Enzyme design. Structure first.
Site, short mmCIF file in Angstrom:
data_model
loop_
_atom_site.label_atom_id
_atom_site.label_comp_id
_atom_site.label_asym_id
_atom_site.label_seq_id
_atom_site.Cartn_x
_atom_site.Cartn_y
_atom_site.Cartn_z
N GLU A 16 22.04 -5.77 -15.65
CA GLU A 16 22.25 -7.09 -16.23
C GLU A 16 22.06 -8.19 -15.19
O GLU A 16 21.69 -9.31 -15.52
CB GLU A 16 23.65 -7.22 -16.84
CG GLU A 16 23.95 -6.24 -17.96
CD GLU A 16 24.51 -4.92 -17.47
OE1 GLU A 16 25.54 -4.47 -18.03
OE2 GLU A 16 23.95 -4.34 -16.52
N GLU A 448 -4.99 3.14 -4.40
CA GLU A 448 -3.62 3.52 -4.74
C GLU A 448 -3.16 3.01 -6.12
O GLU A 448 -1.96 2.75 -6.32
CB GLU A 448 -2.64 3.05 -3.66
CG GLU A 448 -2.87 3.69 -2.29
CD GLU A 448 -1.91 3.16 -1.23
OE1 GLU A 448 -2.32 3.08 -0.05
OE2 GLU A 448 -0.77 2.80 -1.57
N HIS A 658 0.58 -11.87 2.63
CA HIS A 658 1.72 -12.39 1.89
C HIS A 658 1.43 -13.81 1.41
O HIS A 658 2.25 -14.43 0.73
CB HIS A 658 2.99 -12.34 2.74
CG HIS A 658 3.46 -10.95 3.06
ND1 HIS A 658 3.72 -10.01 2.09
CD2 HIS A 658 3.70 -10.35 4.25
CE1 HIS A 658 4.10 -8.89 2.66
NE2 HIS A 658 4.11 -9.06 3.97
N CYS A 690 -1.95 -5.95 5.98
CA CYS A 690 -1.28 -4.89 5.22
C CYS A 690 -1.97 -4.65 3.88
O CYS A 690 -3.05 -5.19 3.63
CB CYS A 690 0.20 -5.25 5.01
SG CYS A 690 1.32 -3.84 4.71
ZN LIG Z 1 2.13 -3.33 6.87
#
Ligand SMILES: [Zn+2]
EC number: 2.1.1.14
Length: 716
Positions: A16, A448, A658, A690
């Site tokens: 919740e 992936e 990011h 990454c």
């Molecule tokens: Zn990484």
């Protein structure tokens, strides 16, 4: 026997909490509706406490992070957020575009938000402890506010981009800080608060005598208040200084370490105060032999008991987990069941209750000493690999995962909720392989698309490991995960990734890398047995992983990547313990990465700096290590540059994944050019920081093209 508990999960049996946060962020509900949802969770939490223990915590329902809550309490709101306007500001600080930094909470998989200290002057901006105390008090339920202590708060914070952990950095801030705690506590006591739960886990860190001098002064200033101080996650090194604190009740974690007990037996425990014995594990889900625990409590001479560390590292309840391997459920206990164990332990100690509840193991135990190194050393393997691969100078590659279309996400959900799915996956891979070839990348990946995350994907395919249906645990904010349970000997019955990687490789002449997760990482994000040494579990997993590597080698895969993020992250809190830890972490990785000389092994490491671990990195059997160099503009390379005898290849991350931004060719160049200051050019690969699973195709494709273009320029 006085029973304490703390850190009961806040997410609720049906998550919740997550639904309330996201429904508020998306506007599906009002702020007043959000607070009503939150109030339900508050009551749910205290009802669990009320049924089981004597001391009921409040101030535990944090709307994003309890460290962020502390920062707000003491007015540490950075200038860029402007006037603090409550929830709106709070969530901008937590998950906004300019959010505070997120990082791991001690040695756990919970992540807190790092306060940024801009002023040396603290003030009481908001009194959540009093607010929550009154909320329950008005209902006629007496509670003890759960707060992060002043030392730990500062220890977890940054100033001018750096930790505030030298004693000479903390002194002045501590003085101003304590003043605000004094105000908060006075208000609590004035309202009839009888006990306050002060959390000081930073006491288990590598501290100096000068830290303890400061800590002593802080608690002298707070000695008039009814405080109970908790420490956990490791032992308190300076035991004598700790039990000298001017507090009436002191909790120690007697589960995660042996030193607290040993030190207590040596120096004894002050008659001037009372010991709260943290004896029920907050970090692992195993039912314990309560008779053994009860004996420990007696040996300690404790009049109070509790869990050793916060319960929020466990799932809420085992109750409905009815598809676990036969006999497993009976050995388990999640957060609710931990409260019940405490109640039972109390009942037993008070006399109210009388009834209380190889083939693969040999391979590990008998491993040849030669099994932890590869057949040929790097220099010789290198010549073999390079001859086989025939790559250009500055080869380009990516780290493994690709953007996930809504279609890809939905499909994976449908399948989890076989032939049709596989077909779909094979379809996306073909597309990705063709896309990479068109872009002109040198070494390809399969993307992936078939994987949820790097641990769950493999955990689900290994013997000795179970996965739960609803065993959710908070990682940060509104994000939860289900930790696997390593309940028995780990082995790998069938190939785990062959289908995808093989098919992928059959579509191109360019090398496609295998993609695996290391042993320590699998362990780190899972629960595991405590009756067996960590290293033996790691080795079992590592040998299972090596099975996959061989199968990959047999199928003609020339490059295999092994991601081991937990390499540093699972290190002990105490630096003195590092060498012993890394000894087996290294061995575990090398067992997994034990590949023929002809096989090029890649290792990805996410760390922002390698200076403290470069010596251990040097012992790993990878051939290529990829690092995230974008954010430091390449300065992260310093550790490698200054390592006399560094000869291994390095995958330079030139792109911050990011961010949605497409880095310009020059923005990438700055990074590559920096790393080339000292290191030979033959060692350098070019790649993103990454994986790309969080990014969109619209920004990935241009970024990849710039990466390739840059490599071309750099070669010329
Ligand atoms: Zn990484």
């Amino acid at each position: 026997t006085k029973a304490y508990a703390f850190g009961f999960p806040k997410i609720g049996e049906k998550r919740e909490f997550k639904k309330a946060l996201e429904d508020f962020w998306k506007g599906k509900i009002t702020e007043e509706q959000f607070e009503e949802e939150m109030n339900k969770l508050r009551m749910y939490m205290v009802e669990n406490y009320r049924k089981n223990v004597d001391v009921i915590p409040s101030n535990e329902l944090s709307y994003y992070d309890f460290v962020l809550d502390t920062a707000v309490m003491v007015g540490a709101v950075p200038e860029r957020f402007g006037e603090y306007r409550g929830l709106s500001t709070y969530f901008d600080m937590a998950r906004g575009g300019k959010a505070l930094e997120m990082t791991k909470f001690f040695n756990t998989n919970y992540h807190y938000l790092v306060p940024e200290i801009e002023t040396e002057e603290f003030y009481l901006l908001e009194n959540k402890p009093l607010e929550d105390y009154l909320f329950f008090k008005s209902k006629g339920i007496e509670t003890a506010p759960w707060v992060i202590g002043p030392f730990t708060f500062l220890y977890l914070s940054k100033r001018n981009g750096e930790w505030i952990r030298r004693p000479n950095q903390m002194e002045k801030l501590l003085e101003s800080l304590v003043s605000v705690y004094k105000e908060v506590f006075e208000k609590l006591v004035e309202n009839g608060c009888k006990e306050i739960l002060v959390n000081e886990p930073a006491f288990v860190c590598d501290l100096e005598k000068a830290h303890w001098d400061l800590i002593l002064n802080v608690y002298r200033e707070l000695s008039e208040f009814p405080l109970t101080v908790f420490t956990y996650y490791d032992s308190v090194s300076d035991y004598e200084a700790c039990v000298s604190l001017p507090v009436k009740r002191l909790h120690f974690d007697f589960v995660s370490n042996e030193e607290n007990l040993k030190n207590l037996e040596k120096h004894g425990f002050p008659e001037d105060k009372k010991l709260v014995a943290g004896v029920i594990n907050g970090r692992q889900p195993w039912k314990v032999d309560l008779r053994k625990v009860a004996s420990l409590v007696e040996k300690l001479g404790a009049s109070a008991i509790s869990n050793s560390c916060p319960l929020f590292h466990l799932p809420v309840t085992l109750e409905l987990e009815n598809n676990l391997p036969g006999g497993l459920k009976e050995k388990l206990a999640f957060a609710k069941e931990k409260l019940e164990e405490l109640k039972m332990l109390k009942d037993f100690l008070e006399g109210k209750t009388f009834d209380l509840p190889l083939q693969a193991v040999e391979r590990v135990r008998n491993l040849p000493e030669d099994s932890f190194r590869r057949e040929k050393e790097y220099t010789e393997r290198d010549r073999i690999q390079r001859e086989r691969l025939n790559l250009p100078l500055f080869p380009t590659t990516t780290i493994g995962s690709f953007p996930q279309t809504p279609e890809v996400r939905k499909m994976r959900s449908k399948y989890r909720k076989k032939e049709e799915y596989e077909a779909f996956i094979k379809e996306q891979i073909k597309k990705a392989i063709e896309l990479q070839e068109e872009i002109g990348l040198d070494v390809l990946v399969h993307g992936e698309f078939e994987r949820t995350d790097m641990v769950e994907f493999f955990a689900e395919k290994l013997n000795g490991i179970a996965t739960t249906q609803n065993g959710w645990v908070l990682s940060y904010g509104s994000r939860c995960y289900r930790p696997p349970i390593i309940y028995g000997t780990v082995t790998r019955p069938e190939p785990m990734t062959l289908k995808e990687i093989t098919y992928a490789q059959s579509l191109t002449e360019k090398p496609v890398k295998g993609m695996l997760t290391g042993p320590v990482t699998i362990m780190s994000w899972s629960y595991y047995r405590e009756d067996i040494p960590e290293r033996e579990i790691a080795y079992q997993i590592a040998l299972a992983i090596n099975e996959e590597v061989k199968d990959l080698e047999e199928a003609g895969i020339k490059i295999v990547q092994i991601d081991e993020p937990a390499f540093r992250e699972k290190a002990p809190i105490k630096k003195s313990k590092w060498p012993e830890y890394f000894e087996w972490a290294i061995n575990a990785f090398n067992l997994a990465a034990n590949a023929r000389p002809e096989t090029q092994i890649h290792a990805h490491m996410c760390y922002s700096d390698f200076n403290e671990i470069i010596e251990y990195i040097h012992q790993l059997e990878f051939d290529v290590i990829s690092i995230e160099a974008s954010r430091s503009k390449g300065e992260i390379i310093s550790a490698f540059e200054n390592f006399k005898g560094w000869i291994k290849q390095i995958g330079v991350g030139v792109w911050d994944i990011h961010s949605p931004a497409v880095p310009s060719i020059n923005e990438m160049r700055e990074i590559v050019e920096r790393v080339l200051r000292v290191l030979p050019k033959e060692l350098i690969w070019i790649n993103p920081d990454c994986g790309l699973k969080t990014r969109n195709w619209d920004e990935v494709i241009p970024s990849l093209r710039n990466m390739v273009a840059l490599a071309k320029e750099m070669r010329e």
